[PDB]
Structures are given as C-alpha cells and as structure tokens.
Amino acid sequence: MITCRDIITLGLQQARVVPLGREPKAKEADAGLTVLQSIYDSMFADGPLGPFTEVYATSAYTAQENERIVTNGAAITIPQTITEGNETRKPYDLTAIIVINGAAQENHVFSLGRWQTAHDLTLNSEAPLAERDKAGLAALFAMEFAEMFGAELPPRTTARGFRFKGAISQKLATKRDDPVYY
C-alpha cells in the first residue's frame, strides 16, 4: 500500500532538497498535501480522465461509465461487473465515475482491477493509480512543487513525468483492432 506520504517523501528527495534517508518535517509534508490534492482534483474536473456525461436521477440508479452523477438524495452504487449480453466483463482501464451530492464530491477511477478513491486524500490513505509506477508519479508531483523551494527538476527525470501524464491521457495499453482493408 503506497501511502500519500511516500510520494511526498520521494518527491522531495527527487528534487534534492531533503537528503537521502531523512524524512520531511511537519510544515513541509503538510503543504505538499494540499498541492497533491490539487493535481488529483484537476484531473476529474477537466483533464485527461475523459469527458463526462450529465445525468440527474433521484432514484436507486446504478452508475455507468464516465457519468457524473449530481443526485441529491439517492443510493448510487458503482458497478463491479458489467453484463453486455453475457459478455460479463470488468470496466475499461482508466474510466472514471463522479457522484456529487449537495456539497461533497466523490470521484472514482478503475485502474488495474480495483476502484481507486481519490477524494479527501489524507496523509495515510493510499494514492490512486500509483501502482502503475511510483517514481513517475513523484516526478509529476515534484515538477512544480519544487518551485516554492529554490531547486527544480533535472531534465533526465522531468521527461519521465511527462511520460506518465501521457500514459494516462491516451489509454493505449488495451489492445485494439487492426486496419481492415475495407
């Protein structure tokens, strides 16, 4: 379970501001939480997690793919399996679900067989979609978080983070069909 504070510890010694083996202090590892929350929250709003579909139902509705639920009082259940004519499949890789009550947003994302949670991301809870790589997610974090300090990231590891942002902005992992010769 890769916690949130493992990224901020890896992110800070990535930009060589804390040394190897020592941990961040209290004021350093609590300003990094508000900016690591901001990058995860700006991916469901309008970013590489795909466009969303509006819906307004006040009933026992179950959510579909890529659907932003804005119900007021209801029971919205995120599906685990989907049966498209006995094609009992799991959902696609990196497709999100938003549920919005009166004032509380709860985003969701399905990355490698598990629904990550990605809201109210505290210092103990696991980071969403960091199982794909750990040292790539700490370079996209520390790319702009290091600017409040003096330092900045070197170019051999800056372009590592721009690969991770493009590896989830394309969803090119799942195999698709060949050209057709029609």
């Binding site: 590489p48 721009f162 029609y182």
Partner: protein, 210 residues
C-alpha cells in the same frame, strides 16, 4: 431439384437417379393417398419423388420419413420402347470436381472491389488522425476526445496537437476503383447494353453471349 453426384456431364446423361423433393401440406397428402392424419392445421411434410435406375428398367418411387407411398415401373416410354425418366435438365458450366456454377459465380470478385473500394474512401475522407507534438500543452486534455474535434468542422482544438490527415494514397484508390468499374462493364455488361449501328452488336456483341 435433386440428382446424384458422380455425374460428370452437364446434360445429366450419366445420372442414375433424379427427383423433385418438395414440401407440401399434410392435409393435401394424407387425404390424397389414404394415410391418416398426424402420423391442428397447416402442418408441413417432406414427400419426395425418385426415378432410380434399379436394373434395366426405371423404377419410380415416392416416399417420406417413414414408409413409402407408391412404387412402380415408370409409365412413360422412350424412342426405343423401354421405360425411362421424364425429368430433363441442363447446367451452365461444370468444374473438375463436380461443381455446377452459373454466370454470377463470376462478377463477384470484381464486385466486392467496387463496394469495398467505396467505403474505404468514405471512411478516409472524413477523419483526420491526430499526432502529438508538444508533450506539455498536449497530454493535458485527452487523446480520443481531441481527434473527434478535428474531424468535425464545428470544433475547438487544444494546443499541442497536429491534424495529420491521410489525403494522400487516395488518388491511388480512385485509380484502382476505376479499374474495376471498367472490367465489370466489359466481362458482364456486354448483352447489347453498352451505349455501333448493328455491326458492333450484330457480330461483335452477340458472339460473346453465344
């Protein structure tokens, strides 16, 4: 129609048995040959005639799934005096192994190349595939959402993406469909539908359909 295999000839001279193999109504079979019913209305049966050469004579028989219904020596004679079959037939072409194809066995390979070389061009002249150029301003919006904004004229395109369309190797497709709209008119559409004055059709058109 129903004949035997192992009959090489397209006039069915070498055949041993030929028949008619129909579907009828169960009312108009049992109340014609005395068989009692259900052995509701509009039930279908599968009676089948059969002219088999059994010895020097030609036996006529007609049966169904259980039991036969009548069976006798064929009543019709021939030019030699001996009883024979009345069924006569003819096929267009024959193959090495015994196939009986017609005319529209051809004009299928030159006709799946007009339907397919038309839907390839319609698919290729509406879609503009999107390549990534600047991986900071791109990799930000989406990938599959952006290339659907390039292919429609009322679109907004984010920075960092380049609309590289495939409006090349389409003039190689138009020159390869128009080679198959012309052969399909030259092997098939000769029978006096091409438009000389009764010379390029009286001796030139009606000798290919001879």
């Amino acid at each position: 129609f129903f004949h035997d295999p192992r009959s090489r000839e397209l006039d069915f001279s070498d055949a041993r048995f030929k028949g008619v193999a129909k579907w009828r109504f169960a009312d108009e079979v049992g109340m014609e040959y005395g068989i009692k019913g259900e052995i509701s209305k509009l039930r279908r049966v599968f009676v089948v005639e059969m002219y088999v050469r059994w010895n020097g004579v030609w036996i006529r028989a007609l049966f169904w799934g259980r039991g036969i219904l009548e069976m006798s020596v064929s009543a019709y004679l021939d030019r030699n005096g001996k009883p024979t079959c009345p069924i006569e037939a003819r096929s267009c072409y024959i193959d090495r192994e015994n196939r009986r194809y017609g005319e529209v066995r051809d004009l299928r390979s030159p006709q799946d190349a007009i339907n397919k070389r038309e839907s390839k061009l319609l698919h290729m002249l509406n879609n503009r595939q999107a390549i990534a150029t600047n991986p900071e301003y791109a990799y930000n919006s989406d990938a599959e959402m952006v290339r659907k904004e390039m292919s429609k004229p009322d679109g907004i395109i984010p920075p960092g993406w380049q609309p590289a369309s495939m409006t090349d190797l389409a003039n190689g497709q138009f020159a390869l469909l128009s080679s198959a709209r012309e052969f399909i008119q030259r092997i098939g559409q000769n029978p006096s539908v091409l438009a000389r004055a009764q010379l390029a059709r009286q001796q030139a058109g009606m000798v290919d359909s001879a």
